[PDB]
Design a protein around this ligand. Structure first.
Ligand SMILES: Fc1ccccc1C1=Cc2ccccc2C2=NCCN12
Ligand SMILES: Fc1ccccc1C1=Cc2ccccc2C2=NCCN12
Length: 301
């Protein structure tokens, strides 16, 4: 993990980066801030290129669309809580998702959003904004405190609150048992496995394949090719993770590295070419008057 670049929010005695994601434009990182701003930075020079006020509370999440035309955001205590922005010529609000605390794009064909409200997953048409599906069954719920609904890599299955759902039928096909209070899980990119906290489940048999105790309370991100997996552990403003990230071989779940940066982590994300990891670190402690985050850029391959 060769450090390539570091930078703080321009013209701020208190740097307030809270999340990041590479833009579809090579060389440029998108960051959310604690004042609800979207910033475009050159990742190598640290130069601020653009700024827009998306929300009047802190950004918690953002996801750019792979064609470079759309952007999802989620805030903290804003109504609306999440939104979809156009970035073709003018930066403008397309649609808002009043109470959804988290949103993603579909993966294969990026023609939907999926948004999460507590235990309840909402699927929307991007062109109309219209709500096509509510996926929720009160008898199968796990009530995960950090539930994040997500599409599989072909868009035909949804994981919501530890329940696998067929989309076309709008039926629940399997409830994974609850083994932690917080993490609800993600699809591997290979379409065959589900990662729910420390449990890796087969999608063909619903058997446990692997136990990975190091993944406990981690948010997980894959490289583009899906051969490497990075995890940063939640804490037991306030930094959402601790000071260390783990990296795993994505095909057998054997550890490659444990990095302590010695500074609490807000986010981490991968470029499209499996070259870089970008990490938001806080230089302050939680007790500090204010935040002081940087972005670091690491060569990996
Ligand atoms: F915890 C989460 C679970 C699922 C999705 C997003 C988050 C999250 C919460 C958060 C809270 C305060 C400041 C920054 C963040 C943040 N930045 C990127 C990830 N993230
Ligand atoms: F096996 C099952 C028994 C009962 C209900 C469903 C399944 C199942 C779900 C699935 C989901 C995503 C990818 C592959 C699969 C799969 N492969 C074999 C069977 N199977």
């Amino acid at each position: 993990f060769r450090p390539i670049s570091v930078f703080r929010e321009a013209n701020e005695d208190e740097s307030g980066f809270t999340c990041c994601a590479f833009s579809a434009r090579e060389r440029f990182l998108m960051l959310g801030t604690c004042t609800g701003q979207l910033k475009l930075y050159n990742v190598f020079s640290g130069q601020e290129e653009a700024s827009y006020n998306c929300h009047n509370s802190a950004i918690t999440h953002l996801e750019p669309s792979r064609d470079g035309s759309l952007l999802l955001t989620s805030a903290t205590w804003s109504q609306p809580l999440s939104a979809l922005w156009g970035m073709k010529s003018v930066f403008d609000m397309k649609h808002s998702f009043t109470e959804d605390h988290y949103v993603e794009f579909s993966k294969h064909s990026q023609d939907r959003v999926i948004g999460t409200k507590g235990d309840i997953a909402h699927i929307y048409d991007i062109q109309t904004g219209n709500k096509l599906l509510t996926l929720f069954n009160p008898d199968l719920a796990n009530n995960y405190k950090r539930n994040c609904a997500t599409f599989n890599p072909t868009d035909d299955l949804v994981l919501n609150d530890g329940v696998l759902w067929d989309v076309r039928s709008a039926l629940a096909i399997h409830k994974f048992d609850k083994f932690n209070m917080n993490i609800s899980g993600v699809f591997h990119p290979n379409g065959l496995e589900v990662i729910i906290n420390t449990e890796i489940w087969d999608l063909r048999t619903f058997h446990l394949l692997h136990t990975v105790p190091a993944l406990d309370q981690c948010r997980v991100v894959f490289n583009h090719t899906g051969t490497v997996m990075y995890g940063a552990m939640l804490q037991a403003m306030k930094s959402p993770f601790g000071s260390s990230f783990r990296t795993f071989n994505a095909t057998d779940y054997k550890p490659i590295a444990t990095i302590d940066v010695k500074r609490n982590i807000f986010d981490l994300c991968t470029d499209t070419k499996d070259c870089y990891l970008a990490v938001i670190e806080n230089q302050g402690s939680m007790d500090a008057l204010n935040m002081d985050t940087v972005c670091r850029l690491y060569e990996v391959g």
